[PDB]
């Protein structure tokens, strides 16, 4: 393509925003300044992301382009790319491209980034066999047969599409990093062929059988979060794993993890785990997620001295004291458990986020010296006191203590009872099996602020 003679920049690039950008690239003072083909023929790269471009009309005269960035714009038609056969790399994520037919003869492409578009038919990719990087997430792709001849691919991402059939991946044995998350995949048997895989991300699919992973011994990163896993026996073979995400599945038996001592991050939340003994040797762990299981005994955590992040919320834990040795902890979440004694938490001097609501905590004094705290959760405690004798008039000590050691006055007291520090008193005409009170006290520890609140049940025995 050539402009016959010199033309105003704003006549070649009809897009207002692209005309401005090209005025700067082409060293001119305004958009109506004329330019020659020889000026145009100098442009070899173009960074034009984030400029509100709607049309790339004019780009066809930039004959020597090898790399372009038009990401984060409002492109629909990419026809002007069709003849730009010196293009090696294209960044075009976050546009409204529906038709990629203009890419079909760009056979020198080694990188093509097209995520976040309106792409369905990828047949125009089929002859782009020099590609080593290809990013197609967040489109409406259901057929990846066009990928089958892309035998130099090292990195491939098509997460957030509607793919069921992975068979076209079979011959892509140079793949090292693959992401197929948020598709409609159940059968990952073709993945057994991809023995060079180092990273496999496959969250939010319908995978129950992971036997095909058994020979993928080069895997260092694996994510199967949001699947239907139960038997993870195959993972024992994956001795190079350092980062493993298995959250939101149906796993109970963790024995296959026990030899995976390279692990530094391990997500196991939302499963069926009641025994974490097999985790005890994973001493390189800095992050461990165990929320939403059926844990009571967490004693096997005590040796994991490198943990800086730990989740335990939604379990059946009464004894939190195994965390006392995890002196590097910076964030600890254990909301919805049955913990009453937080004396052990005085040890976690570097703690910054402490999330402890919906437990049985009555006394904040062991937390008083934790001044690196910036986020704090103490709402909605509840516990039941040891019973006391039912009588016509019943008096109990209030036992809710603030961080200062001062008793916190009840907010409400059942059965018309009253408070005179330190005693809560009820006049009880007829026998009742229990009485109760609530408390609600804003509090700050360091720079972390919450409402320390709860409901206290007092059984009365006759």
């Amino acid at each position: 393509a050539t402009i016959t003679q010199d033309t105003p920049i704003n006549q070649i690039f009809t897009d207002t925003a692209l005309a401005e950008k090209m005025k700067t690239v082409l060293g001119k003072t305004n958009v109506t300044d004329t330019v020659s083909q020889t000026d145009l023929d100098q442009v070899t790269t173009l960074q034009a992301d984030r400029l509100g471009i709607k049309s790339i009309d004019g780009v066809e005269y930039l004959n020597n382009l090898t790399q372009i960035n038009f990401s984060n714009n409002q492109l629909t038609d990419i026809t002007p790319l069709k003849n730009l056969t010196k293009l090696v790399d294209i960044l075009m994520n976050n546009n409204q491209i529906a038709d990629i037919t203009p890419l079909a003869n760009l056979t020198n492409l080694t990188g093509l980034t097209l995520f976040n578009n309106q792409i369905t038919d990828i047949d125009p990719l089929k002859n782009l066999t020099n590609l080593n990087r290809l990013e197609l997430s967040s489109n409406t792709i259901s057929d990846i047969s066009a990928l089958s001849g892309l035998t130099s691919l090292q990195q491939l991402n098509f997460s957030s599409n509607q793919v069921t059939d992975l068979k076209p991946l079979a011959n892509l044995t140079t793949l090292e990093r693959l992401d197929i998350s948020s598709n409609k995949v159940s059968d990952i048997s073709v993945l057994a062929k991809l023995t060079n895989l180092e990273s496999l991300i496959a969250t939010n699919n319908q995978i129950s059988d992971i036997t095909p992973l058994g020979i993928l011994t080069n895997l260092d990163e694996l994510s199967l979060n949001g699947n239907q896993l139960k038997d993870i026996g195959t993972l024992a073979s994956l001795t190079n794993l350092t980062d493993l995400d298995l959250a939101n599945n149906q796993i109970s038996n963790l024995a296959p993890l026990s030899g995976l001592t390279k692990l530094t991050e391990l997500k196991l939340g939302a499963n069926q785990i009641s025994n974490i003994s097999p985790l005890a040797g994973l001493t390189a762990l800095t992050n461990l997620e165990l929320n939403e299981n059926q844990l009571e005994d967490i004693s096997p955590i005590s040796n994991l001295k490198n943990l800086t992040y730990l989740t335990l919320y939604f379990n059946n834990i009464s004894d939190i004291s195994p965390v006392s040795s995890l002196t590097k902890l910076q964030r600890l979440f254990f909301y919805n458990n049955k913990v009453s004694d937080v004396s052990s938490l005085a040890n976690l001097t570097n703690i910054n986020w402490l999330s402890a609501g919906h437990n049985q905590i009555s006394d904040l004094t062991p937390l008083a010296n934790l001044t690196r705290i910036t986020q704090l959760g103490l709402n909605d405690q509840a516990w039941t006191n040891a019973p006391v004798n039912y009588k016509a008039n019943v008096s109990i000590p209030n036992t809710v203590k603030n961080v200062t050691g001062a008793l916190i006055a009840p907010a409400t007291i059942s059965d018309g009872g009253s408070y005179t520090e330190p005693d809560i008193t009820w006049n009880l005409p007829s026998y009742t099996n229990e009485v109760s009170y609530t408390f609600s006290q804003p509090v700050t520890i360091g720079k972390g602020t919450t409402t320390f609140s709860g409901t206290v049940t007092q059984p009365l025995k006759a």
Binding site: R50, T113, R177, N204, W353, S355
Partner: protein, 107 residues
């Protein structure tokens, strides 16, 4: 202002290799728990310039980075997460989120 947010610290090495977008961390509200929860983010690098460096998967809360970073250009981003139920109700207040750009490694 912690509410029911559960968020790991977030760092991203500069000069990362693809494929993009790449998972950083999975953000969670435990009202999820008692419903499906739907996530969004705001801040410089999300909805204000530079726009779209970070995005979040609405249904899963996966926070992702969309291109290579440069510590000499931006070293930290401050973002804010938001959570709502299927009925549209807000199930959390916004949470300020730091993202630290760190040494490169070939991940």
């Amino acid at each position: 202002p912690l509410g029911s947010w559960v968020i790991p610290p977030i760092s991203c090495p500069e000069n990362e290799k693809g494929p993009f977008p790449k998972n950083l961390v999975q953000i969670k509200s435990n009202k999820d728990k008692e419903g499906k929860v739907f996530y969004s983010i705001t801040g410089q690098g999300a909805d204000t310039p530079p726009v779209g460096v970070f995005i979040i998967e609405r249904e899963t809360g996966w926070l992702k980075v969309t291109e290579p970073l440069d510590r000499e250009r931006i070293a930290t981003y401050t973002l804010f997460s938001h959570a709502v139920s299927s009925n549209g109700n807000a199930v959390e207040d916004p949470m300020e989120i730091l993202i630290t750009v760190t040494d490169q490694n070939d991940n």
